[PDB]
Amino acid sequence: KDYQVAMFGIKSDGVTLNTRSIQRAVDYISEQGGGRLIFYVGRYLTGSIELKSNVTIRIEEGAVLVAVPSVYDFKGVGGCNAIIYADKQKNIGIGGKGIIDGRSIAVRASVEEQLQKGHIEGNVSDYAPALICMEGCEDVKIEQVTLQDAANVAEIYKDCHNVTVDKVVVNAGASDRKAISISGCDGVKMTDCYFNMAGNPLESAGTSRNLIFTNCITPDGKAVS
Incomplete structure (x- = not known):
């Protein structure tokens, strides 16, 4: 069953x-046993x-999931810190x-400000969220979205099983960082993915297996792979 976001007071x-x-x-x-959460049109601040087991989030064409420029409104240090994250979930x-918009400059400036005041300790990278982060997940289906x-980093896959990433577009925006971080995964099939950046988009710990990259390219x- 599909659920329209407006029905839950999402504006x-x-x-x-x-x-x-x-x-x-x-x-x-x-x-309820799973289903899909549909974002049909407009801008959704978050x-x-x-993400929980048996749930799919759909950001339809014309819809944007936009990051709030506030460090404390994200997950923070330790594990998956992203706009959409999942920890040990299945069938997600x-x-x-649609688009997931990271608002990198405004989000990182919020992180920078709290570090400079000493309200948090570390580097901006410890608190700045990824767009998507999956850790210890099984049967993950990512498709069509513009990151x-x-x-x-746009996407982080850590210790996941049976991940598919299809027709995804990564637009660097103001980011000079990697598009994808992969470590300890088993079965990752990436097909028809576009990276609008010039350099190597992929960061790998070299601890993954059954990785298949088909027609995943940079602008050149x-x-x-």
């Missing part, structure tokens, strides 16, 4: 912070969303031709 005005209502929708849908997905201007048309 597409680009100014209402929807984190808690999106999370409750994800939690409710998982409790902090970190925890992200789809739709734009990530505050850190050079293979990404």
Whole structure:
């Protein structure tokens, strides 16, 4: 069953912070045995969303999931810190031709400010969220979405099994960072993915197996693998 976001009080005005209502929708849908959360059109402001087992988030064409420029509205240090993250979940997905917008400069400036005041300790990289981060997940389906201007890395896959990434577009925006970080995965099939950046988009710990990259390219048309 598909669930429209408006039914959970999620607002597409680009100014209402929807984190808690999106999370409750994800939690409710998982409790019902699974289904899809549909973002149909407009701008949806959010902090970190925890994806749950048997839930797929769809950001349809014309819809944008936009990061709030606030360090404390993200997951933070330790494990997966992203706009959409999942920790030890199964049968999860992200789809739709919409956009996930990281607002990297404004998000990183928020992190920088709290570090300079000494309210948090470390480097900007310790707190800046990825757009997507999956850790210890099984049967992950990522497709069609445009991942734009990530505050850190666009996608992180750590200790995952049976991951598919299809027709995804990564737009660097203001980011000079890697597009994808992969470590300890088993079975990752990436097909028809575009990286709008010039350098190597992939960061690998070299601890993954059964990795298949088909037609994954940079603007010059050079293979990404």
